[PDB]
């Protein structure tokens, strides 16, 4: 179908890699949305899967942060992709993780686990995030330290850029944690928001309906627990049609891995 070419590839761990592809000249999307991408199976039939566009809406190229599931119909194949090869990329962007889907506010929270940081790798590089809000809080929880690397480097590259470094350094608050390995900050996003620990570590006021807006992206179980916690602070799930305090999107469907 619609074919695009891989321009670069980077493996982060034995189960995580990112790659950038050429962008369809017709593509127009909002930072945070996802599209369907895929490869042909052995019978020449499409293996399609939804993927958040990890790059900001203004980037000339498209980037994706992907898991590597051995025996995974798509990623067992995609994990071998090389520069110059191609993938199917359908330019029909959709998704609820968009600023327009949230009432204006002053503090924006990105709550993610595992590859769920993909749509935020996009939003953290979206000019609109820093224009419409005073602070942007990026909470990324993973089992191990290595899983945080892609996000760590991204946040690092932002807060250090010669041009917008000081700017971002002042509004972006990066809060990574591990739950299975030793790290300076640990614990689930749910637990750390509920107990109040994150508000203390970051030296900021607790969550409130009037100023806080959040985007949630992780496993279904994670999404449901974060919702209750957010609701415990008076926030309500919104909609692109009726904007409120928070929005959610599954980082993937199924059990775990
Ligand atoms: C809205 C939406 C957006 C998504 N965006 C991304 C993204 O940006 N990057 C990404 O890697 N995946 C993303 N996923 C998952 C993605 O669509 C595919 O599932 C992934 O490419 C795996 O495909 P597969 O055919 O190799 O394995 P599958 O048969 O699809 O899945 C086998 C099992 O692996 C697990 N799994 C699948 N994907 C993940 C993952 N992301 N993280 C942890 N476990 C997983 C689940 O338990 C799944 O049942 C997204 C899913 C949805 C529903
Ligand atoms: N059938 C089974 O008994 C079975 C099947 C598959 C995997 N697993 C186990 O699960 C592990 C893989 O990780 P996982 O799925 O538990 O994490 P996960 O969704 O893949 O995502 C990574 C992170 O989200 C956190 N998380 C998971 N559930 C959460 C929730 N309900 N609320 C808030 N945060 C949550 C995890 O913390 P935590 O580490 O505390 O989860 C982890 O930090 C493996 O170590 C494996 O041993 C068990
Ligand atoms: C003028 C630079 C603006 C801010 C850059 C810091 C983020 S880091 C940067 O982000 C770009 C956009 O996603 C990518 O194309 C690039 O490869 C990546 O290193």
From Swiss-Prot:
GO terms for biological process: cellular response to oxidative stress; heme catabolic process. Residues 1-100 form the FAD-binding FR-type domain. It is an enzyme of class 1 (oxidoreductase). Keywords: Cytoplasm, FAD, Flavoprotein, NADP, Nucleotide-binding, Oxidoreductase. One of its GO terms (molecular function) is nucleotide binding. It is found in: Cytoplasm. FAD binds at residues 49-52, 65-67, 73-75, 115, 251-257. InterPro entries: Cbr1-like_FAD-bd_dom, FAD-bd_FR_type, Flavoprot_Pyr_Nucl_cyt_Rdtase, FNR_bac, FNR_nucleotide-bd, FNR_type-1, OxRdtase_FAD/NAD-bd, Riboflavin_synthase-like_b-brl. Its EC number is 1.18.1.2, 1.19.1.1. Its cofactor is FAD. NADP(+) binds at residues 113, 143, 179-180, 188, 225. GO terms for cellular component: cytoplasm. It comes from the Bacteria. Monomer. Transports electrons between flavodoxin or ferredoxin and NADPH. This is Flavodoxin/ferredoxin--NADP reductase. It comes from Rhodobacter capsulatus. The lineage of its organism: Bacteria, Pseudomonadati, Pseudomonadota, Alphaproteobacteria, Rhodobacterales. The gene is fpr.
């Amino acid at each position: 179908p619609d074919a695009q070419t891989v321009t670069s590839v980077r493996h982060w761990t034995d189960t995580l890699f990112s790659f950038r592809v050429t962008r369809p000249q017709t593509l127009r999307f909002r930072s945070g949305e996802f599209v369907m991408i895929g490869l042909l199976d052995d019978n020449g039939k499409p293996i399609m899967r939804a993927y958040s566009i990890a790059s900001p809406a203004w980037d000339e190229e498209l980037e994706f942060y992907s898991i590597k599931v051995p025996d995974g119909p798509l990623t067992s194949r995609l994990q071998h992709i090389k520069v110059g090869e191609q993938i199917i990329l359908r330019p029909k962007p959709v998704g609820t993780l968009v600023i327009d889907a949230l009432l204006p506010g002053k503090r924006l929270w990105f709550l993610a686990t595992g590859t769920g940081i993909a749509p935020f790798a996009s939003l953290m590089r979206e000019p609109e995030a820093y224009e419409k809000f005073d602070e942007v809080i990026m909470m990324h929880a993973c089992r191990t330290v290595a899983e945080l690397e892609y996000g760590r480097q991204l946040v690092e590259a932002l807060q250090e850029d010669p041009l917008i470094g000081e700017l971002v350094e002042g509004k972006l608050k990066y809060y990574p944690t591990t739950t299975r390995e030793e790290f300076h900050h640990m614990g689930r996003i749910t637990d750390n928001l509920a107990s109040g620990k994150v508000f203390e570590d970051l030296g900021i006021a607790p969550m409130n309906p009037e100023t806080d807006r959040a985007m949630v992206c992780g496993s279904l179980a994670f999404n449901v627990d974060v919702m209750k916690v957010l609701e415990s602070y008076g926030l309500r799930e919104g909609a692109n049609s009726e904007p409120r305090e928070f929005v959610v999107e599954k980082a993937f469907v199924g059990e775990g891995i």
